[PDB]
Amino acid sequence: PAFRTFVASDWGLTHLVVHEQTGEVYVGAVNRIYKLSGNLTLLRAHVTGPVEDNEKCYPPPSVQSCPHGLGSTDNVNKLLLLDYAANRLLACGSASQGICQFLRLDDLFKLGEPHHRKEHYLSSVREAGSMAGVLIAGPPGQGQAKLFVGTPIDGKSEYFPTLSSRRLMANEEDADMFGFVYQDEFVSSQLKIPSDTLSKFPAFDIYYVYSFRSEQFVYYLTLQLDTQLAGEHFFTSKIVRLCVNDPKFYSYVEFPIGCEQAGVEYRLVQDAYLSRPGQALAKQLGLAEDEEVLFTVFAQGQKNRVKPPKESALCLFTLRAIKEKIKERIQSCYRGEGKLSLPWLLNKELGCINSPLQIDDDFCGQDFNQPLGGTVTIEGTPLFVDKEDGLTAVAAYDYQGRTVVFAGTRSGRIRKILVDLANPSGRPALAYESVVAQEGNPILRDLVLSPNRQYLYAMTEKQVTQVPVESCVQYTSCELCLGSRDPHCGWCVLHSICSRQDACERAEEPQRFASDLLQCVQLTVQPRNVSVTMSQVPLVLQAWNVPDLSAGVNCSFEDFTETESILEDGRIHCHSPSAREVAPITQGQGDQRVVKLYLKSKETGKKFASVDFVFYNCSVHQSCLACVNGSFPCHWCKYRHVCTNNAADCAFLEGRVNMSEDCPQILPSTHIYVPVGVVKPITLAARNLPQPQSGQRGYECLFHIPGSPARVTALRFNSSSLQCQNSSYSYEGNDVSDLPVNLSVVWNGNFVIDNPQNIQAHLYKCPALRQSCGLCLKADPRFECGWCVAERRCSLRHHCPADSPASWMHAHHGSSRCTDPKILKLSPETGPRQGGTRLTITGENLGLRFEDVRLGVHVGKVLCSPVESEYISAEQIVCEIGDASTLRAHDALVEVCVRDCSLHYRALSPKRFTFVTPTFYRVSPSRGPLSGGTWIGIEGSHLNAGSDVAVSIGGRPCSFSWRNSREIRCLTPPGHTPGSAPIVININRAQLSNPEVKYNYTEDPTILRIDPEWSINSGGTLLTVTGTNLATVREPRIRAKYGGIERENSCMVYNDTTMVCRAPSIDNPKRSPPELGERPDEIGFIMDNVRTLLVLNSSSFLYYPDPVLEPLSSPLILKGRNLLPPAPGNSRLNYTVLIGSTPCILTVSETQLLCEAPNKVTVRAGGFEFS
Ligand SMILES: *[C@@H]1O[C@H](CO)[C@@H](O[C@@H]2O[C@H](CO)[C@@H](O[C@@H]3O[C@H](CO[C@H]4O[C@H](CO[C@H]5O[C@H](CO)[C@@H](O)[C@H](O)[C@@H]5O)[C@@H](O)[C@H](O[C@H]5O[C@H](CO)[C@@H](O)[C@H](O)[C@@H]5O)[C@@H]4O)[C@@H](O)[C@H](O[C@H]4O[C@H](CO)[C@@H](O)[C@H](O)[C@@H]4O)[C@@H]3O)[C@H](O)[C@H]2NC(C)=O)[C@H](O)[C@H]1NC(C)=O
Ligand SMILES: *[C@@H]1O[C@H](CO)[C@@H](O[C@@H]2O[C@H](CO)[C@@H](O[C@@H]3O[C@H](CO[C@H]4O[C@H](CO[C@H]5O[C@H](CO)[C@@H](O)[C@H](O)[C@@H]5O)[C@@H](O)[C@H](O[C@H]5O[C@H](CO)[C@@H](O)[C@H](O)[C@@H]5O)[C@@H]4O)[C@@H](O)[C@H](O[C@H]4O[C@H](CO)[C@@H](O)[C@H](O)[C@@H]4O)[C@@H]3O)[C@H](O)[C@H]2NC(C)=O)[C@H](O)[C@H]1NC(C)=O
Ligand SMILES: *[C@H]1O[C@H](CO)[C@@H](O[C@@H]2O[C@H](CO)[C@@H](O[C@@H]3O[C@H](CO[C@H]4O[C@H](CO[C@H]5O[C@H](CO)[C@@H](O)[C@H](O)[C@@H]5O)[C@@H](O)[C@H](O[C@H]5O[C@H](CO)[C@@H](O)[C@H](O)[C@@H]5O)[C@@H]4O)[C@@H](O)[C@H](O[C@H]4O[C@H](CO)[C@@H](O)[C@H](O)[C@@H]4O)[C@@H]3O)[C@H](O)[C@H]2NC(C)=O)[C@H](O)[C@H]1NC(C)=O
Ligand SMILES: *[C@@H]1O[C@H](CO)[C@@H](O[C@@H]2O[C@H](CO)[C@@H](O[C@@H]3O[C@H](CO[C@H]4O[C@H](CO)[C@@H](O)[C@H](O[C@H]5O[C@H](CO)[C@@H](O)[C@H](O)[C@@H]5O)[C@@H]4O)[C@@H](O)[C@H](O[C@H]4O[C@H](CO)[C@@H](O)[C@H](O)[C@@H]4O)[C@@H]3O)[C@H](O)[C@H]2NC(C)=O)[C@H](O)[C@H]1NC(C)=O
Ligand SMILES: *[C@@H]1O[C@H](CO)[C@@H](O[C@@H]2O[C@H](CO)[C@@H](O[C@@H]3O[C@H](CO[C@H]4O[C@H](CO)[C@@H](O)[C@H](O[C@H]5O[C@H](CO)[C@@H](O)[C@H](O)[C@@H]5O)[C@@H]4O)[C@@H](O)[C@H](O[C@H]4O[C@H](CO)[C@@H](O)[C@H](O)[C@@H]4O)[C@@H]3O)[C@H](O)[C@H]2NC(C)=O)[C@H](O)[C@H]1NC(C)=O
Ligand SMILES: *[C@@H]1O[C@H](CO)[C@@H](O[C@@H]2O[C@H](CO)[C@@H](O[C@@H]3O[C@H](CO)[C@@H](O)[C@H](O[C@H]4O[C@H](CO)[C@@H](O)[C@H](O)[C@@H]4O)[C@@H]3O)[C@H](O)[C@H]2NC(C)=O)[C@H](O)[C@H]1NC(C)=O
Ligand SMILES: *[C@@H]1O[C@H](CO)[C@@H](O[C@@H]2O[C@H](CO)[C@@H](O[C@@H]3O[C@H](CO)[C@@H](O)[C@H](O[C@H]4O[C@H](CO)[C@@H](O)[C@H](O)[C@@H]4O)[C@@H]3O)[C@H](O)[C@H]2NC(C)=O)[C@H](O)[C@H]1NC(C)=O
Ligand SMILES: *[C@@H]1O[C@H](CO)[C@@H](O[C@@H]2O[C@H](CO)[C@@H](O[C@@H]3O[C@H](CO)[C@@H](O)[C@H](O)[C@@H]3O)[C@H](O)[C@H]2NC(C)=O)[C@H](O)[C@H]1NC(C)=O
Ligand SMILES: *[C@@H]1O[C@H](CO)[C@@H](O)[C@H](O)[C@H]1NC(C)=O
């Protein structure tokens, strides 16, 4: 399927609304207002735009001449409101001091556009969506239609009211339009900004986000400025209310609003949506049917209303609960308690006047204690929190009780949330996510469900998108359908599709529609496994949770065949396909084919229920073991040497194998030893070896040697023993002494007998791997291979002459001392005098038992105790050296005495082991942060000695890296308390100290300010960073996370407080920063192990896009977009235009580059380059 869509050809869009009768969609935009069909085809386009004008001008040029220069500017649709009563559309713009338009409902015919009087002007403000309001009407002749409307003011306090109650006459040409409901010289149905409050706080302003009529009132969710929170701008999100029938404006109330999630504040409204909850949420939230509810979206903190944070939270307010907070607050001021507390309105705080009254929800305000504020900020019930992708918009609706919530994202995605706090579940769960403008066009607050409530029109900066509330057809299986949980979806069993109740034909009937996973179709077949050779087999089918199929059913194994079935009891009876049909499937897939046997219903003609059905083919098994000891019923024919399902297909009666133990198989004996180049027979045992029959040859042994494969014919003595005949074997290499070889026993040329234990023949050569007595007697007693004195080499008795009765020596049981031990080399060459070192000696002709080498090892005089486990016989001894403090020598040769220190049986090391006492004198940072993670460089002498090393700062262990004669490098642990700390290094049994060389733990550095608060996509600009203890980190660097990519860059420390840093590149071909600017996912600094500095919560650092540049005595002029960003303060890019190597003196402008040239051209700005 494809998502129905309307694209914004030229400009940005601002507002959308749906006509409750027609389903026509009206769309407010900059310079345009469109009418669209339900499926988003363009129906009519109104030009409202580019108008010659100027914001500074009061009454706009039409009425009076203005001395300020005029220019063609864009007219932003600020507001849009459906007036069904007068068959039209209020289409309120800007850029004319905010004059309002009336477009006729069905053709967009301008009925009127009043702009003579001062009330016809709404606000200079050119910002979209900072305005809102509601249209409310009575019948013609009675109290006429009124408009309640909030807008920002931009400091034009005396020109416009922020909130107003205005008149809507039936004639659009009538001059009375947008006049106040009741005007007096004392009090008018409007609320102005006081001049005193603008003098005190310079640019205070009220931005109106959402607005709705409820019962008899009118609410507004608003954003205001710092007035008890001159300084900087911080915003407070509040609710406002009025009685509809209060011309005096005395009912005004104003409570701060937000919500908290695990100690994180969310105080900035982005959107809201009044709705119903339906039976579900209502009940367990404790409400009556017609009781209302308010879904909202808030961003984290109270910072940057112009560009809020990603961190966003969807909260909830029951209107009964806000009504109680307002009633509770009024029944409180009418007790005379405290002040009114409304900073921006009343600068000098007037007091609450006590009085006896019946305080009701019907209370519409009175003369004294007047317009009043709120102290207790109203907290909301949180539902879902996005941390990587900011929520932007919301809607909700009642579906068959269950409450579905819709949530726009900064990405251009919509979430479909069942709110389940009042529902059984642990917390409200996301059901589904969907895509609109994937590239990252944010969704806008104006997000309306259709009248039929089948779709949801989702608006972006650049496109409207008809997203269906229900799209269950994406669900392929009963198990996934009812698994998604998004409540519109059910499994329409007989159609085998997923959709709503009203879409499944005959759903009302028994078992025809499934709503809980337990209703899903469950199927089983009695003969699950059927052989390829069988045909038309009777199968019984048990199925549960299925409607009456007396309509008829067919069995289809897949889209290959289809057999008719008859019904009896609670079971279905159909037949397997014919052999003629079965094999066309199984051909190719060999061993077996699992196939999804369906049921095709006669009523629908769609497959719905399935099972795993197995088609097994015995024949493809090419050994007895696979055939019988497999998973299936298969018979093996000893004599034909073929696997098949039919007993009769076997050679004859006494050659059928049905049991795995009766297989023709080779049994193991104690290992098959085969010397190279020696004539030997190889007797084998086995079981049930076949008597070769008519036209069948005898047995052979085939040896799979990569060098040479030998074919030797054999004799089968009985059903249980074989023997390959006298022959010699070889391999070409002399590289490995012991080579195990795969052997296959064949008869009649190609019939290979089964080898389960996979018995091998070991071809051994008397050593091509061992030129030392110790190595030979080390190897198997099986080989018979032994060491022969005279030759100075090792071979069997067979291959070595007996000149003496004891000239050939073999390790009898290992009780064989071995001559002329030799040491090749030993590791650690140096060691500490205290000992404890593990000496690692590697020789060639050592002793064959441990208990003879133990006590034999010595380092000069020093007794060395050898280790059992780490000792590899006659190749290697691992030995632990004892205390060498008392030794006079500085270095000594190593000695091994095999068992006795006999004159021929002693070895002495070619180079000698050295004793030292390592010392240290300096550390190369002597200071570091308390969190630790500092790269320490301990300088000294003999530091590479011994085996183990352990460095302890304050008793706590250092993470070791590498060791040297002169240096030890390790990474510091966290310190307990800041200040001087002892450094203890222990090498084996030597523990060396120095109280003159200490390590000073410092208080963790802090980051305060980065100065410019921005950079470009490729980075590379200077950043003037300030903080504390910055000299205590030697190599600090900046870190930034943009999208799925993390990047780093260098810093240069100057003071303990100052640092210059080069901004990190975020160059991503997936995302590019917008012209407006964008915060990174994360920004911080890498400073050792101080991890709180890796991620900066309070940071407002922005990233702008890299410059766009156009290629091919008079000066150089280089044109292009994005040359200068809208940045705070002075701070701009240090551009340098160069020619081969020579820089020029240039003046930089927003679209052009004014270099100067005397007549290969490169432009640089930070880490950016272009030609
Ligand atoms: C269940 O599975 C079985 C087995 O997997 C399968 O039966 C196979 O059916 C296909 C037909 O599509 C056969 O494949 C074709 O074979 C053509 C020639 O067959 C000759 O060679 C056979 C192979 O001998 C090998 O196997 C034996 C024993 O393991 C081994 O000792 C040998 O060394 C050798 O490797 C041989 O079995 C066969 O003799 C059969 O037929 C006679 C007469 O009916 C019967 O008496 C025997 O008992 C025996 O069953 C015969 O001599 C060949 O033309 C063709 O090859 C061409 O096409 C391919 C692919 O395009 C090209 O790559 C190639 O270059 C050729 O141009 C093709 O391979 C296959 O031989 C059957 N398998 C067997 C064991 O016979 C069925 O799908 C399933 N059974 C059912 C009932 O559905
Ligand atoms: C051809 O088929 C055969 C036979 O089916 C198959 O044989 C396997 O051989 C390996 C050896 O390589 C066996 O591994 C051994 O396991 C020994 C313990 O066996 C007991 O426990 C088994 C596992 O118990 C779990 O699973 C079962 C069933 O799922 C469950 O009931 C239990 O609760 C538990 O979760 C169990 O399978 C087994 O029961 C078998 O035998 C009985 C009696 O015949 C029969 O009733 C069952 O039907 C079933 O076949 C039994 O209860 C373990 O002790 C052993 O290690 C020792 O023995 C060796 C040799 O004696 C010593 O050298 C060694 O030092 C140890 O002392 C070994 O690890 C494996 O269990 C066999 N598998 C089966 C299914 O029987 C081959 O794999 C097949 N070969 C080929 C080439 O296809
Ligand atoms: C440790 O070392 C560091 C430096 O390594 C040091 O930090 C600087 O210290 C020096 C003095 O030693 C200060 O420089 C003085 O600035 C005086 C005027 O200040 C104005 O101009 C500043 C510099 O402009 C440069 O940088 C900007 C931005 O990068 C750039 O656009 C320009 O092109 C230009 O190159 C400017 O930063 C500063 O703005 C500060 O103040 C505002 C508002 O209060 C604040 O919001 C900012 O955050 C910012 O801090 C301001 O506009 C100037 O008069 C003075 O010149 C005298 O001294 C020189 C040399 O001794 C004499 O030759 C001359 O006759 C003058 O008497 C000098 O240039 C600089 O302000 C510090 N930097 C910062 C960021 O604070 C630490 O102080 C050192 N610690 C010590 C000394 O213990
Ligand atoms: C291929 O397709 C076939 C479909 O027919 C599948 O065969 C079925 O396998 C399952 C197990 O894999 C069997 O369930 C078991 O049933 C036994 C009781 O068996 C007795 O009753 C059977 C039905 O009433 C009957 O068919 C049996 O008779 C057979 O055996 C005789 C003698 O060998 C033979 O002559 C006949 O021809 C029959 O073949 C027999 O009297 C039951 O004891 C099992 O429970 C045990 O195991 C479980 C799990 O470990 C354990 O929890 C219990 O405690 C208990 O120990 C088990 O339920 C089923 O009976 C088979 N159906 C038939 C018709 O034989 C087969 O699975 C498919 N093959 C593969 C590889 O998938
Ligand atoms: C281990 O590491 C710690 C931390 O690095 C060391 O402590 C630091 O010592 C340095 C020496 O280089 C100090 O700098 C000097 O500060 C003194 C005056 O110190 C006073 O002022 C400080 C800054 O305003 C202030 O932080 C101090 O207060 C601390 O102590 C109290 C009480 O214990 C505590 O309650 C506080 O919380 C503070 O922690 C203190 O009142 C000054 O004389 C020096 O000035 C010289 O240099 C300047 C500039 O060049 C020059 O103009 C002058 O003429 C003069 O020559 C110098 O600034 C630093 O303040 C200490 N930092 C911390 C965090 O304590 C500690 O010494 C190390 N141990 C060892 C054994 O070396
Ligand atoms: C404007 O939007 C409207 C709806 O808001 C829309 O017109 C509708 O199109 C649908 C199909 O997209 C039509 O619904 C049909 O109703 C008839 C019964 O009269 C059925 O026969 C149709 O069934 C067919 O289609 C099924 C699903 O694809 C098939 O399974 C089946 O085999 C049939 O072929 C179908 O349910 C309907 O006619 C109108 N709606 C109304 C109220 O008339 C249209 O897409 C948009 N039009 C424009 C000009 O933009
Ligand atoms: C449920 O199962 C039943 C029985 O298993 C099954 O009945 C089948 O119906 C089709 C007709 O749709 C029969 O096929 C016909 O057979 C004649 C010969 O007698 C053929 O000449 C025809 O084949 C032509 O048409 C085909 C399809 O267009 C072409 O592929 C082909 O090239 C020919 O031109 C004709 O289709 C078939 O014989 C029976 N099946 C059996 C096993 O007899 C039916 O499909 C199912 N019932 C229902 C109501 O769906
Ligand atoms: C000597 O014989 C050995 C053992 O028989 C051979 O090594 C291994 O042979 C087995 C066959 O039993 C291979 O195992 C296979 O594994 C896959 C797993 O995906 C499985 O699907 C197959 O059914 C099969 O069991 C295994 O690949 C193979 N080992 C290696 C490393 O390839 C060996 O090939 C023989 N030596 C020589 C030199 O041929
Ligand atoms: C060869 O084998 C036969 C029979 O096993 C035996 O008599 C003879 O000793 C063997 N010959 C040699 C040279 O090993």
Coordinates of N, CA, C and O in Angstrom, one line a residue, residues 38-78:
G38 N -11.0 14.5 0.8 CA -10.7 13.5 1.9 C -9.4 12.7 1.6 O -8.8 12.2 2.6
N39 N -9.1 12.5 0.4 CA -8.0 11.7 0.0 C -6.8 12.6 -0.5 O -5.9 12.1 -1.1
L40 N -7.0 13.9 -0.1 CA -5.9 14.9 -0.3 C -5.6 15.3 -1.7 O -4.4 15.7 -2.0
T41 N -6.6 15.3 -2.6 CA -6.5 15.9 -3.9 C -6.7 17.4 -3.7 O -7.5 17.8 -2.9
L42 N -6.0 18.2 -4.4 CA -6.2 19.7 -4.4 C -7.6 20.0 -4.9 O -8.0 19.6 -6.0
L43 N -8.4 20.8 -4.1 CA -9.7 21.2 -4.6 C -9.7 22.7 -4.9 O -10.3 23.0 -6.0
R44 N -9.1 23.5 -4.1 CA -9.0 25.0 -4.4 C -7.9 25.6 -3.7 O -7.6 25.3 -2.5
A45 N -7.3 26.6 -4.3 CA -6.1 27.3 -3.8 C -6.3 28.8 -3.8 O -6.5 29.4 -4.8
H46 N -6.2 29.4 -2.6 CA -6.4 30.8 -2.4 C -5.0 31.4 -2.3 O -4.1 30.9 -1.5
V47 N -4.7 32.5 -3.0 CA -3.6 33.3 -2.7 C -3.9 34.3 -1.7 O -4.9 35.1 -1.8
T48 N -3.1 34.3 -0.6 CA -3.3 35.2 0.5 C -2.0 36.1 0.6 O -2.0 37.0 1.5
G49 N -1.1 35.7 -0.2 CA 0.3 36.1 0.1 C 1.1 37.0 -0.8 O 0.5 37.8 -1.5
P50 N 2.4 36.9 -0.8 CA 3.4 38.0 -0.7 C 2.8 39.4 -0.8 O 2.3 39.8 -1.9
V51 N 2.7 40.1 0.3 CA 2.1 41.5 0.4 C 3.2 42.5 0.6 O 4.1 42.3 1.4
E52 N 3.0 43.7 0.0 CA 3.9 44.8 0.2 C 3.5 45.4 1.5 O 2.4 45.9 1.7
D53 N 4.4 45.4 2.5 CA 4.1 45.8 3.9 C 5.4 46.0 4.7 O 6.5 45.8 4.2
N54 N 5.2 46.4 6.0 CA 6.2 46.5 7.0 C 5.7 46.4 8.4 O 4.7 47.1 8.8
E55 N 6.3 45.5 9.2 CA 5.8 45.2 10.6 C 5.8 46.4 11.5 O 4.9 46.5 12.4
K56 N 6.7 47.4 11.3 CA 6.9 48.5 12.2 C 5.7 49.5 12.0 O 5.4 50.3 13.0
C57 N 5.0 49.5 10.9 CA 4.0 50.4 10.5 C 2.7 50.1 11.3 O 2.2 49.0 11.3
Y58 N 2.1 51.1 12.0 CA 0.8 51.0 12.6 C -0.2 51.8 11.8 O 0.1 52.8 11.1
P59 N -1.5 51.5 11.9 CA -2.3 51.0 10.8 C -1.6 50.9 9.5 O -1.0 51.8 9.0
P60 N -1.6 49.6 8.9 CA -0.9 49.3 7.7 C -1.1 50.2 6.6 O -2.1 50.9 6.6
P61 N -0.2 50.2 5.6 CA -0.2 51.3 4.5 C -1.6 51.5 3.9 O -1.8 52.7 3.5
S62 N -2.5 50.5 3.9 CA -3.8 50.7 3.3 C -4.6 51.9 3.9 O -5.1 52.7 3.2
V63 N -4.5 52.0 5.2 CA -5.3 53.1 5.9 C -4.5 54.4 6.0 O -5.0 55.5 5.8
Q64 N -3.2 54.4 6.4 CA -2.4 55.6 6.6 C -1.1 55.4 5.9 O -0.6 54.3 5.8
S65 N -0.5 56.5 5.6 CA 0.9 56.5 5.0 C 1.9 56.2 6.1 O 1.7 56.8 7.2
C66 N 2.9 55.4 5.8 CA 4.0 55.1 6.8 C 5.3 55.5 6.2 O 5.6 55.3 5.0
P67 N 6.2 56.2 7.0 CA 7.5 56.6 6.5 C 8.5 55.5 6.4 O 9.5 55.6 5.8
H68 N 8.2 54.4 7.1 CA 9.0 53.2 7.0 C 9.0 52.5 5.6 O 7.9 52.4 5.0
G69 N 10.1 52.1 5.1 CA 10.2 51.5 3.8 C 9.5 50.1 3.7 O 9.6 49.3 4.6
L70 N 8.7 50.0 2.6 CA 7.9 48.7 2.4 C 8.7 47.7 1.5 O 9.5 48.1 0.7
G71 N 8.4 46.5 1.7 CA 8.9 45.4 0.9 C 8.0 44.2 0.8 O 7.2 44.0 1.7
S72 N 8.1 43.5 -0.3 CA 7.3 42.3 -0.5 C 7.6 41.2 0.5 O 8.7 40.6 0.5
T73 N 6.7 41.0 1.5 CA 6.9 40.1 2.6 C 5.8 39.0 2.5 O 4.8 39.1 1.9
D74 N 6.1 37.9 3.3 CA 5.2 36.7 3.3 C 4.1 36.9 4.4 O 4.4 37.4 5.5
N75 N 2.9 36.5 4.0 CA 1.8 36.5 5.0 C 1.6 35.1 5.5 O 1.1 34.2 4.8
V76 N 1.9 35.0 6.8 CA 1.8 33.7 7.5 C 0.4 33.5 8.0 O -0.1 34.3 8.8
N77 N -0.2 32.4 7.7 CA -1.5 32.0 8.3 C -1.2 31.7 9.8 O -0.6 30.7 10.2
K78 N -1.7 32.6 10.7 CA -1.5 32.4 12.1 C -2.5 31.5 12.8 O -2.2 30.8 13.7

